[PDB]
Amino acid sequence: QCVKLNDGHFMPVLGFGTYAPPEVPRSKALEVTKLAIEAGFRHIDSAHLYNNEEQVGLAIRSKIADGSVKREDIFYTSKLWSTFHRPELVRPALENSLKKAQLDYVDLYLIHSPMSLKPGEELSPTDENGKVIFDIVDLCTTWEAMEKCKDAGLAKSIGVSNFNRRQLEMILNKPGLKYKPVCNQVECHPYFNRSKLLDFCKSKDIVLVAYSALGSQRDKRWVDPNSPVLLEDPVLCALAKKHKRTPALIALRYQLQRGVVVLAKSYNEQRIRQNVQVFEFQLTAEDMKAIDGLDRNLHYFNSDSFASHPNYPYS
Ligand SMILES: NC(=O)c1ccc[n+]([C@@H]2O[C@H](COP(=O)([O-])OP(=O)(O)OC[C@H]3O[C@@H](n4cnc5c(N)ncnc54)[C@H](OP(=O)(O)O)[C@@H]3O)[C@@H](O)[C@H]2O)c1
Ligand SMILES: CC[C@@H](C(=O)O)c1ccc(-c2cc(Cl)cc(Cl)c2)c(C(F)(F)F)c1
């Protein structure tokens, strides 16, 4: 139930999203990560931005101390936040994540976003008028510092997130490139299937990783409340009736059958265990076709602040 990356390492096909808005107490992240591991999740997706590596790190070590799982069985993912894009800031930001998560290494270390921000300890650098402050960093130099982390054995694999094709090509055509990004974690779901980008990554042996596969958490901070609810789609519901499954299981299985590693966030014990039921059933060739036809080029995250960034991936 794993896929081989272009560096030889293997990543579980289903991953547990660990982001919850800050209004949720951080103790929940420690509990649901235990429930997710008990339910079958081995791939755990986190980030320095999420502010939960302390809790997710303890939940991993707890379930290891239980004997329920071993560290090698767990595929931990972290992300380098935008404020730490400069080369001298990459390795310090990774070992800080390692120190907080109580880990000697991360399985996967990502560039969280190509939209560089002003360097500093603050994650949302704001100016006097409410503007988020942008920065100008050559991401090829950022990637070089990621390569030094993989050679230092602090990240078994390295990759990117929220990169478009041309932003990927910039890395792929970098003189002196030592490692290729094993993955590119982007927003992907039946409404935003990213089919064109998916064929590009497959032709370079880059694993597409779908976040907001269940249509996101719909935070009013970033999501228009008038956008359609993904899991209330008539086609996904009608397929949920046909396979006696849930609309969510249809959305996750769709990504698995098309070669996309899927993430699934949930802070409810019953919906955590229900998500691993994605391995019990299968969709026909027709049903995969029906889901492909729901595409509407709709990304649920939309903000005017980032849309003026020169590295804003969408257009
Ligand atoms: N690289 C990036 O830039 C990036 C961006 C966004 C997200 N991510 C990662 O991807 C993960 C998932 O993305 P997301 O935050 O948008 O959440 P999501 O996977 O799209 O899920 C959306 C909502 O669906 C609910 N849910 C879970 N299982 C369900 C089920 N069987 N049936 C019905 N509803 C279910 C969950 O609510 P409940 O919690 O109440 O169960 C969840 O809030 C995140 O946690 C994060 O790790 C990465
Ligand atoms: C809050 C959750 C967080 C996570 O990583 O889970 C997250 C969600 C969405 C985005 C995002 C938003 C836009 Cl509008 C465009 C794009 Cl490309 C990406 C970002 C990012 F990358 F901006 F930081 C981060």
Swiss-Prot record:
User: What, per the annotation, is the impact of changing residue 221 to P?
Assistant: Decreases in the retinaldehyde reductase activity. 3-fold decrease in the kcat value, whereas the KM value does not vary
Q: Which InterPro entries match?
A: AKR, AKR1C, Aldo/ket_reductase_CS, NADP_OxRdtase_dom, NADP_OxRdtase_dom_sf
Q: Which PROSITE patterns match?
A: ALDOKETO_REDUCTASE_1, ALDOKETO_REDUCTASE_2, ALDOKETO_REDUCTASE_3
User: Which principal EC class is assigned to this enzyme?
Assistant: oxidoreductase
Q: Which UniProt keywords apply?
A: Cytoplasm, Lipid metabolism, NAD, NADP, Oxidoreductase
Provide the GO biological process annotations: cellular response to calcium ion; cellular response to corticosteroid stimulus; cellular response to jasmonic acid stimulus; cellular response to prostaglandin D stimulus; cellular response to prostaglandin stimulus; cellular response to starvation; daunorubicin metabolic process; doxorubicin metabolic process
- Record's superkingdom? Eukaryota
Q: Where is this site: Involved in ligand recognition and product release?
A: 222, 301
UniProt site positions, description: Lowers pKa of active site Tyr: 79
Which EC number(s) does UniProt give? 1.1.1.-, 1.1.1.210, 1.1.1.53, 1.1.1.62
Q: Where in the cell is it found?
A: Cytoplasm
The residues listed in the UniProt record as binding NADP(+), with positions renumbered to this chain, are: 18-19, 45, 161-162, 185, 211-217, 265-267, 271-275
Q: Which Pfam families match?
A: Aldo_ket_red
Name its pathway.
Steroid metabolism
Known role: Cytosolic aldo-keto reductase that catalyzes the NADH and NADPH-dependent reduction of ketosteroids to hydroxysteroids. Acts as a NAD(P)(H)-dependent 3-, 17- and 20-ketosteroid reductase on the steroid nucleus and side chain and regulates the metabolism of androgens, estrogens and progesterone. Displays the ability to catalyze both oxidation and reduction in vitro, but most probably acts as a reductase in vivo since the oxidase activity measured in vitro is inhibited by physiological concentration of NADPH.
- Name recorded for this polypeptide: Aldo-keto reductase family 1 member C3
Q: Which organism is it from?
A: Homo sapiens
Point out the gene that encodes the protein. Answer: AKR1C3
